[PDB]
Amino acid sequence: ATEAGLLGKNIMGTGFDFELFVHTGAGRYICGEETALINSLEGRRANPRSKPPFPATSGAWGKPTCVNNVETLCNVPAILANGVEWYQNISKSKDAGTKLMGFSGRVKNPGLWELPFGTTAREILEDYAGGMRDGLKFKAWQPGGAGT
């Protein structure tokens, strides 16, 4: 993207300058917390910070900072290219847009699919993951990871 003019100085001749870096972490789970992420980005221990102030007001090195997930930033260009009216008409639910959902653990197809919001968990388990394996019966499930 830097060779193609999509990054660096004078992006698309519009005067906007943007530099993108990859900061490879050193293996600690608490670094995903956004204020702990800011502290880890500054070369400190990844202790989180009390809010207020939120990182939008004073984040990385005291400057205004916005932290977003990979999937939100992947949802952004589809909104900017196809429009708002397409994004609001993806699903007839309160939460607009699609979401990466999937089932894991002793199922027939443990995987990852992109589904609209409002998709029930039985379709993810049975119509996509194939249901439980042979000789195993369903007992419980966690919807959104280890912290749910």
Added chain:
Amino acid sequence: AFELSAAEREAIEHEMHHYEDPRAASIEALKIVQKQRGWVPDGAIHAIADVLGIPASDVEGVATFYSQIFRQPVGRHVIRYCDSVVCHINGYQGIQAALEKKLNIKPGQTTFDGRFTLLPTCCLGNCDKGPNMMIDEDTHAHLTPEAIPELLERYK
């Protein structure tokens, strides 16, 4: 007696070029030293502190905070097996038992010849293909206890 190499020092300065504060290159400086020498020795903390202009106490606290920065000597290859909830469901304990049988060591220890260092680690982000093991740079999925000693012979 520790001395930073020229390539290590130049990589560290190129890392501090990326940030507005030289303190922000401490993690990557420790990772550069770890990649060059396998681990981070005692004098490396003072060397990185002298290059970065921050106190050595903060560098030591950063090195001891992060699990992937090793402040104790490890073997030539580091096996990191996932022990989180999905791989517990997929049965990482058979993999751990096979690893302890083949290497004759407990987790957190080093083989007598310095070839392997066995370590538990958190979720590797490969839960749909669990259980997962992470040797030095390569992640191996769909593990079975029978394939463990076959997999371990390709890391001399």
Added chain:
Amino acid sequence: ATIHVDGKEYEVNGADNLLEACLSLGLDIPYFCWHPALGSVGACRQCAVKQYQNAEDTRGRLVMSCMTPASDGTFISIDDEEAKQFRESVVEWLMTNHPHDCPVCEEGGNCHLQDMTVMTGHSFRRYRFTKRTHRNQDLGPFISHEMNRCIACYRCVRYYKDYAGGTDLGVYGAHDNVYFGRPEDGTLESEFSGNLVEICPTGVFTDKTHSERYNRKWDMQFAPSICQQCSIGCNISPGERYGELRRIENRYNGTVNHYFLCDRGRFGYGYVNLKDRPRQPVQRRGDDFITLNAEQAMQGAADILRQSKKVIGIGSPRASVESNFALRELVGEENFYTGIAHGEQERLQLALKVLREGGIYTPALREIESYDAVLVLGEDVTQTGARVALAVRQAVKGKAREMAAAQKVADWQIAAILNIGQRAKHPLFVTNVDDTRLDDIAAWTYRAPVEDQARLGFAIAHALDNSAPAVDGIEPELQSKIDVIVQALAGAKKPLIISGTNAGSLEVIQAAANVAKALKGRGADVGITMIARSVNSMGLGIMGGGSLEEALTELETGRADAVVVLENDLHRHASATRVNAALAKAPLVMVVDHQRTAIMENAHLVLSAASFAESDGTVINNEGRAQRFFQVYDPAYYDSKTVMLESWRWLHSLHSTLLSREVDWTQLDHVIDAVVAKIPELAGIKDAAPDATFRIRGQKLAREPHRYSGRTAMRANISVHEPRQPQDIDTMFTFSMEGNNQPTAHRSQVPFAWAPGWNSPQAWNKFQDEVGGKLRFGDPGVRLFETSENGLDYFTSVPARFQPQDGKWRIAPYYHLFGSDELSQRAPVFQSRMPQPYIKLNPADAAKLGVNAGTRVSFSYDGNTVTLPVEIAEGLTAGQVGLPMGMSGIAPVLAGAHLEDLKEA
């Protein structure tokens, strides 16, 4: 702001958080990780209360009172069942890994964790698993380390790094294996590391000097006193057990030294417990040393003083105002000589003239932290006035404070303040002959000789105001740095100029006065701070008198056949050979002292004076504030043969026996009234402390706590009969527990802080009007002088630049917090912390002499050849050699002098 705590209405400050507001109202909320001087972080999760949205709310939510502002119309509950249960649960979680260590822990009975465990009501253990353990580190001779007792409250790292600016202490590790200490075994390098024994709420950091002869807090006899190890005058609480000074605690003074002392004051008290101290009056008769009691000592001294034709008295800046005044009355005003050299006296009188005649306000030690730019000229503040350096660090962080204040962030939310003001700081410009300990935060550092530092100050004053004398011969790089300093100082609302007499240059003080006058002429709120040398240097300068050299000429010419030296070794202010010859020529030498000095061999009479632990008196600190120190213990309580009196008592009894041949000792208030009547410049010392008739509802003030123990067994080996309790006719304190130490008592002198449920140093919160503010009924001490209406004129004596002459070496002064003070080197625990005696050389000078680093070179001063090893000082200017002042064999008057035949031995 209006808050409602448990249904009761309170009026508080809306800028405060809920924890400090509720502690200021007398309410009890447990807390660990919050400190008034350090701010709120929300770590220990102990200060939880239940906040309600409105008045008609029942559910509420658990919030943290240190992290919640005490805004108007707030509704909280402390005694709510869920809040109490959560606080007990937090204490229980802290108690899961705590070692069973209280009997063998130096924090026992003085522990904040003990008080909060009892306060939360947690006394039943149901945790049945193992407890984590930690190895300990060697942190040096002053601090003892025991990491098993840690509760991970992060007070030590926050104080040591954010507040004190230290670098070698930190937090390491992870989830429950957090370690607090140094990265490796070694001595803690901060000059204020000793405050960790009061900052830490547990026994992780402990006073090792106290841990040698350890006794509990309830067994201590405490007094309110003033630290005598430099001129800052920090308020201390000396505590004694079994006739020896056991500990020095920080006594809260919101105007001076609120929560923190320096290491020299905290650990340099060991000279009091020396076994070679004089305990009885001794008279020399040939080769015999006859021990007398006080009456025959006064009779004999009266006869020999009456037979003499002219008696002279040599005072000291170590002694109090009353003792120096008593010597001055005994020998006469014209025969009274200050015990300091002529150059030292000239610098001290110039500093006094600047302070009380320059028309510029002199800030207190707490007021220094509110200044917007700091220029330090010549004075190594960290090594001579260390608490001023700590306050300078706080004033430097004031820029981050105001940057966070501009973003509507509360002043107690310290993490957001440090995040917003990342590395921006108020301008600090320090000048010295070498590197200082303020170089890490200084905007600029000028390593130059004292003439060049004075010329830099004169050029700054000329560039600020063109009426000041100009300096010719400024290099363009130096002119650019001068322009940077001038642009910083001119744009500051509250500039501060700090100088002192330790630089050994009159012109440095003149340049600092010129800078302060130039900043005052522009309408700025400039303050000036002069750092003196000893505890009562300012008082001795105000009292005045001749120099030591004039007294030595009076002894050598035979005009004075009797000399009375009061608490002065006389070798730090003049050459030793001249002093010894002048004292050996005099047929009567009487040394009134509490330390075994080198001039006592020639002394015909030695009076066993009292130190600060065994005497009352008044000392004037560097800002001109008179402060009364009180006697801690009776020396003659244990050893009945010990005749050790106050110095003013000794000299007043001597004067009475000389005049009327009868022995009357004094009362202390009589000496105070005599000082006020005779010296109108010292008339403010009457209001420093109330007199000996002051009572709190009829009772005196207790020196020892109400649970003092052993009263029928402390002296049982000497005699099974209990002796008479020592009576204190001098002051309002009593040598017993039968007194008043209530936190609500109408007084300013507090011997020690204790409240029911608060046995730790956190009882000072109960002893304040608001937490972190002043004492409830005013801080002790009164300024002797106000700011004058009109100022001085510009000092036109601009010195010439430093020219390195061949064969002569200018002695650059080097000061050390451990070693430069006269009494602190006598403390045996300092010798491990005292540096080896080296000499500093430039690389060019060492290459010219052909000497390396570590080799021994010999130099002759006043016909005395002494050899020292060599370090290579890079920042030292060529033509100068660096000597450590106040050391063994190196008198502080050598600063600014010249050296001959400095060559390799």
